[PDB]
Design brief:
Elements lengths: L3 E4 L2 E3 L5 E6 L4 E7 L5 E7 L3 E10 L2 E9 L4 E8 L7 E8 L3 E7 L2 E8 L4 E6 L7 E4 L3 E5 L3 H10 L2
Parallel strand pairs: 9-11
Antiparallel strand pairs: 1-14, 2-13, 3-10, 3-14, 4-5, 4-13, 5-8, 6-7, 8-9, 10-11, 11-12
Bound molecules: a molecule of 5 linked components (BGC-GAL-NAG-GAL-FUC).
PDB class: viral protein
Keywords: Glycan, hbga, rotavirus, viral protein
Assembly: monomeric
C-alpha cells in the first residue's frame, strides 16, 4: 500500500524520497530530528484554546522552556529550528491542523515539511549539506509514503486519514 503503517514510535535515519506522515496523539514533543551538523528541528504540539503558558520540553537532551499559546480551535504544531549546535531555537514554521498529522521528507539536499493551515497547508524546504545523516526520534505512530505519492500525503495532511 501507498500508505505504509502505522509504525510504532522509534528512532531512525529515514530513507530519502519518502514522506513520514506522523500522527500526533498528545501535546508535547512530536519528534526531534537532527544530523548534529547543520539541521535541528523539533516539533511541539499545543492543543486548542491554550492561553499563554510556560511549558518545558526536552529537545535533543536539553531542557527548554517556551511560553506557548494557541487561540485557535485547531491543534498547532510548532517547528523549533536551529542550524548549528551553538545557536538558539526559533519557531521557524507552524502547521495549524485539526487532522493532527505532520509531514517530513528528506529529498534532494533538503528537508521538506508541511506548514500553514489545513486544508490549505503547503510544503516548504530547508537546505542541508548533510541530508542522509539526519535522524529522527518519533514519539508517536507514523506512516511512510513514497514521494511519488506526495499528492496522497498532501490529502492526508490537509483532510485527515
Ligand atoms: C515545483 C515542484 O516540483 N515542487 C515540489 C518540490 O520540488 C523541488 C524539490 O525536488 C527540490 C529538491 O529537494 O528541488 C527543486 O528543484 C530545483 C532543482 O533541483 C534545481 O536544479 C533547480 O536549479 O532549481 C529547482 C527549484 O529550486 C524542486 O522544485 O518538492 C517538494 C517536496 O517533494 C514538493 O512538495 C513540491 O511539490 C509541489 O508542492 C506544492 C505545495 O507546496 C503543490 O502541492 C504542488 O502541486 C507540488 O508540485 C507538484 O508535485 C511536484 C512533485 C511536481 O510533480 C510538480 O510539477 C507538481 O506540480
Amino acid at each position: 500500500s501507498i500508505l505504509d503503517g502505522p509504525y510504532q514510535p522509534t528512532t531512525f535515519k529515514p530513507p530519502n524520497d519518502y514522506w513520514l506522515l506522523i500522527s500526533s496523539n498528545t501535546d508535547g514533543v512530536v519528534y526531534e530530528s537532527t544530523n548534529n551538523s547543520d539541521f535541528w528541528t523539533a516539533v511541539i504540539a499545543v492543543e486548542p484554546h491554550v492561553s499563554q503558558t510556560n511549558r518545558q520540553y526536552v529537545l535533543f537532551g536539553e531542557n527548554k522552556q517556551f511560553n506557548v499559546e494557541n487561540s485557535s480551535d485547531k491543534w498547532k504544531f510548532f517547528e523549533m529550528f536551529k542550524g548549528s549546535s551553538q545557536s538558539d531555537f526559533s519557531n521557524r514554521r507552524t502547521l495549524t491542523s485539526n487532522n493532527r498529522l505532520v509531514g517530513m521528507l528528506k529529498y534532494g539536499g533538503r528537508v521538506w515539511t508541511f506548514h500553514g493551515e489545513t486544508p490549505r497547508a503547503t510544503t516548504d524546504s530547508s537546505n542541508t549539506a548533510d541530508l542522509n545523516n539526519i535522524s529522527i526520534i518519533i514519539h508517536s505512530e507514523f506512516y511512510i509514503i513514497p514521494r511519488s505519492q506526495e499528492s496522497k500525503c498532501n490529502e492526508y495532511i490537509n483532510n485527515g486519514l
